[PDB]
Design a protein around this ligand. Structure first.
Ligand SMILES: N=C(N)c1cc(-c2cccc(NC(=O)C3(Nc4ccc(Cl)cc4)CCNCC3)c2)cs1
Ligand SMILES: N=C(N)c1cc(-c2cccc(NC(=O)C3(Nc4ccc(Cl)cc4)CCNCC3)c2)cs1
Ligand SMILES: [Mg+2]
Ligand SMILES: [Mg+2]
Ligand SMILES: [Mg+2]
Ligand SMILES: [Mg+2]
Ligand SMILES: [Mg+2]
Ligand SMILES: [Mg+2]
Lengths: 5, 236, 236, 5
């Protein structure tokens, strides 16, 4: 799953 | 509000304590109480609010994904009918997730965004609005799915427009906004090319502005830039 | 009970789903509902109950320890008065912990223990009773601290007496009981020599019985034996 | 902190 902040 | 009798400063102090204790549901409840005092939030307070709810909903999302995967497997051709229980429990977690998102969106609408005039506050809150509509979109399946997706898109777009006008390309809020909007494009909007273009352009424009930064600001910006690169590596 | 309208089998199924999703508060609520159906629990069901509440209270204990440490530091000579907030929030977590322990102890008293006649069920439940009085003892400071400690001791002792009469020395329940009673001696009862003697004797008596076991039983027993050795290494 | 199960 891709990175989010 | 159960927090209505507690001092604003005490709520913020307890949110920080709850964070140290990894009690993020408490942290979110304290920060909800602080928001409901009606005063604008400082930079630190905005990040306490965001950390709290990101951790709460992050756990819900992880649980929902496990349960959705079990449910999809239970419905494949060749499986043993396991009754309504998997669907029921996935729905329970889903409803709780939607409730948390509605709570955060309600705080942003009443009345954090309308009072946020500085770029650093307004972009931050509009990014959050995009994020929590994105989490709603991750579980949406009915008549309102398209409208939820467009609500996320619209919030992210207003945040982008402000950030490009008012912040440098290395500003970590601008970078984190672009990171998440890029993920929205890839995972929600079925727009992988937009996701890749946004991540790449954001990375390159930040690269060219790093020379203006202090050592500490450089660290902040390059950390988010690495996440952009990580996603680009995943996607290409 | 909020679970009173759900089928026993559905509650157990959802407890297992909650475990896969790492939703241990839900798992505990489901297993509480299953207990309250009034039927005895199977071996698997007893372990679902124990896993659920051990994870819930384990998180509470970890949070309480963080908050207690912050509170003790805030009270050292030379600190800045940080108001009542640290104490208040430590008390809040403490009360929630005590509530979970009281809930588990209530399930054991109404009526799991009185119906448990087989050694594997009765020792398991009496161990749990010792464990949850031990967690209450970890936070106790008032008129009832000694009585809480003696309640833990008494439950562990009855479990030990049954286990020595009815189970082989390698039985994992007997081993886990002795492991935890040994920790009770060390950390709660201020009896490190008893803790060490119990751990050592338990380990040696199990060692001498391993030859009777299958490969799978050997694995189960030696895993707990390693924990006994780990504690002995910590303590000597 | 010591091991318990
Ligand atoms: N947790 C607390 N108690 C407090 C945290 C802050 C704070 C205040 C300002 C910035 C941050 N940066 C972050 O959190 C991280 N970057 C980030 C960037 C953009 C966005 Cl839009 C959101 C996050 C999170 C991911 N890895 C790198 C740091 C934290 C003040 S208090
Ligand atoms: N989690 C689930 N869904 C289920 C678990 C079981 C089960 C059923 C029987 C035994 C176990 N053993 C354990 O759990 C562990 N040993 C243990 C030993 C003594 C005690 Cl008194 C308690 C624990 C826990 C620590 N490391 C090794 C295994 C599990 C059936 S279902
Ligand atoms: Mg006030
Ligand atoms: Mg639904
Ligand atoms: Mg563009
Ligand atoms: Mg029935
Ligand atoms: Mg108290
Ligand atoms: Mg002895």
């Amino acid at each position: 799953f891709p990175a989010t902040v | 509000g159960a927090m209505g009798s507690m001092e604003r400063a005490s709520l913020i102090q307890k949110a920080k304590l709850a964070e140290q204790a990894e009690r993020y549901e408490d942290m979110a409840a304290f920060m909800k109480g602080a928001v409901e005092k009606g005063e604008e939030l400082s930079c630190e307070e905005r990040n306490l609010l965001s950390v709290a709810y990101k951790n709460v909903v992050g756990g819900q999302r992880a649980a929902w994904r496990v349960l959705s995967s079990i449910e999809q497997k239970s419905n494949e051709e060749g499986s043993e009918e396991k009754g309504p229980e998997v669907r029921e429990y996935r729905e329970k977690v889903e409803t709780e997730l939607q409730g948390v998102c509605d709570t955060v969106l309600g705080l942003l609408d009443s009345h954090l965004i309308k009072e946020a005039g500085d770029a650093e506050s307004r972009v931050f809150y509009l990014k959050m609005k995009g994020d929590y509509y994105r989490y709603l979109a991750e579980v949406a399946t009915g008549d309102d799915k398209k409208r939820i997706i467009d609500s996320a898109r619209s919030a992210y777009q207003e945040a982008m427009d402000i950030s490009k006008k008012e912040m440098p390309p290395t500003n970590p809020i601008r970078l984190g906004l672009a990171l998440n909007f890029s993920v929205f494009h890839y995972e929600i909007a079925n727009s992988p090319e937009e996701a890749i273009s946004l991540a790449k352009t954001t990375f390159d424009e930040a690269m060219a502005d790093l020379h203006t930064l202090s050592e500490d600001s450089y660290k902040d910006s390059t950390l988010i830039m690495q996440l952009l690169r990580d996603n680009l590596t995943l996607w290409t």
